């Protein structure tokens, strides 16, 4: 998070941290005791599918206090439409091995109803993104959890304000842009998978997933997030189906 602040311990209770063999992988969001939503591109190079863990209650990655809870990721389900290496359909639903205990430091983020998301949350201007990823484009990842309030943009305006290229993907209808284009604030690598949470009348909902961008805080660019509204159905469905016998699972999307 470039330009953020330190998220007070316990204020980002839905923040998950994923690790592969002890090493920081991505961020993720907790939607209920055994389900986490992250970003499909984070598992493009996981050939140790069991050495993947998720941590909740985490805040400071240097000290261990009485709050962290860790679980192995039993399964990782990605849309059948996601192509490894690309940024479209960048969503992953992770089934933990055992549930977590909700405590004052571990609470899930509400997965909003699609209509409510498209029609009401989408016009809430600022939402929060968080993580322990780089603090400058190729700077150091953080140790304490960082949170940043970014404004959302409708794609016409994103396209209208971005400096035409790099070998970018397009901003499809499965993504959205949020951020600043004056290179001051943005999410960065190491933040991928974490949440874009919107506050509406007292509750917080998951509206996006940190996905991609041109560098981090590059001038003339904004950060791109997976638009979660387009996957609710899909998620809910998967969360009510039988476990099926795979670690990586590619579920039919839509």
């Amino acid at each position: 998070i470039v330009g953020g602040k330190v998220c007070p311990k316990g204020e980002c209770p839905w923040q998950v941290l994923l690790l592969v063999n002890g090493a920081q992988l991505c961020g993720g969001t907790l939607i209920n005791t055994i389900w986490v939503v992250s970003a499909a591109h984070c598992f493009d190079k996981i050939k140790n599918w069991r050495n993947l863990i998720a941590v909740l209650g985490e805040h400071d990655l240097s000290e261990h206090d009485g709050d962290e809870q860790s679980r192995r990721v039993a399964q990782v389900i990605i849309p059948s439409t996601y192509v490894p290496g690309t940024t479209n359909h960048d969503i992953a639903l992770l089934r933990l091995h055992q549930p977590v205990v909700l405590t004052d430091h571990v609470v899930p983020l509400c997965l909003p109803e699609r209509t409510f998301s498209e029609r009401t949350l989408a016009f809430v201007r600022f939402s929060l993104v968080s993580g322990w990823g780089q603090l400058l484009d190729r700077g150091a990842t953080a140790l304490e959890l960082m949170v940043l309030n970014v404004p959302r943009l409708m794609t016409q305006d994103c396209l209208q304000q971005s400096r035409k290229v790099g070998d970018s993907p397009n901003i499809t209808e499965y993504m959205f842009c949020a951020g600043y284009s004056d290179g001051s604030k943005d999410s960065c690598k190491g933040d991928s998978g974490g949440p874009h949470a919107t506050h509406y009348r007292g509750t917080w909902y998951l509206t996006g997933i940190v996905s991609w961008g041109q560098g981090c805080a590059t001038v003339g660019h904004f950060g791109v997030y997976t638009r979660v509204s387009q996957y609710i159905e899909w998620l809910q469905k998967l969360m009510r189906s039988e476990p099926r016998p795979g670690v990586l699972l590619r579920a039919p999307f839509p």
Binding site: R125, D157, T172, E173
Partner: protein, 149 residues
């Protein structure tokens, strides 16, 4: 659907209306207004009119700078969205009521605890007059003088 164009702000004593083009052929419009960092509030839901009264909103904080946009939907499928699954729209110019509304003791459309305020209760010492009379707000860049009587 075609996007609206020539979005203009017509405003006098804070009565603020936005107008645009075109006159819609089998499509409707909805308008949204915000402050730079405020959430967007929708108005004139699915109308065929090419104007929208945004007074109620802008007189909440006449010193904010508002931005508005107009969405266009085919009628019937007022859930029409384009390739990036969002409805077609176009933005207006910014408008800072306190500095761009036109002037004409007068009441303004600005209200405080249910009543209306007056040209002076809104512009205090930024309002001077001329003699026939003209009202002038020298602390302006545009529309600094009113008309005459």
């Amino acid at each position: 659907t075609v996007a609206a164009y020539n979005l203009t702000w017509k405003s006098t004593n804070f009565k603020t209306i936005l107008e645009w083009e075109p006159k819609p052929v089998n499509q409707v419009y909805t308008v949204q207004i915000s402050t730079k960092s405020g959430d967007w509030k929708s108005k004139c839901f699915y109308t065929t009119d090419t104007e929208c009264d945004l007074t109620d909103e802008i007189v909440k904080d006449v010193k904010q700078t508002y931005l508005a946009r107009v969405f266009s939907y085919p009628a019937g499928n007022v859930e029409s969205t384009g390739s990036a699954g969002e409805p077609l729209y176009e933005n207006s110019p910014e408008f800072t009521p306190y500095l761009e509304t036109n002037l004409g003791d007068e009441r303004t459309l600005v209200r405080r605890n249910n009543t209306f305020l007056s040209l002076r209760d809104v512009f205090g010492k930024d309002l001077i007059y001329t003699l026939s009379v003209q009202a002038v707000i020298p602390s302006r860049t545009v529309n600094r003088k009113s008309t005459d009587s």
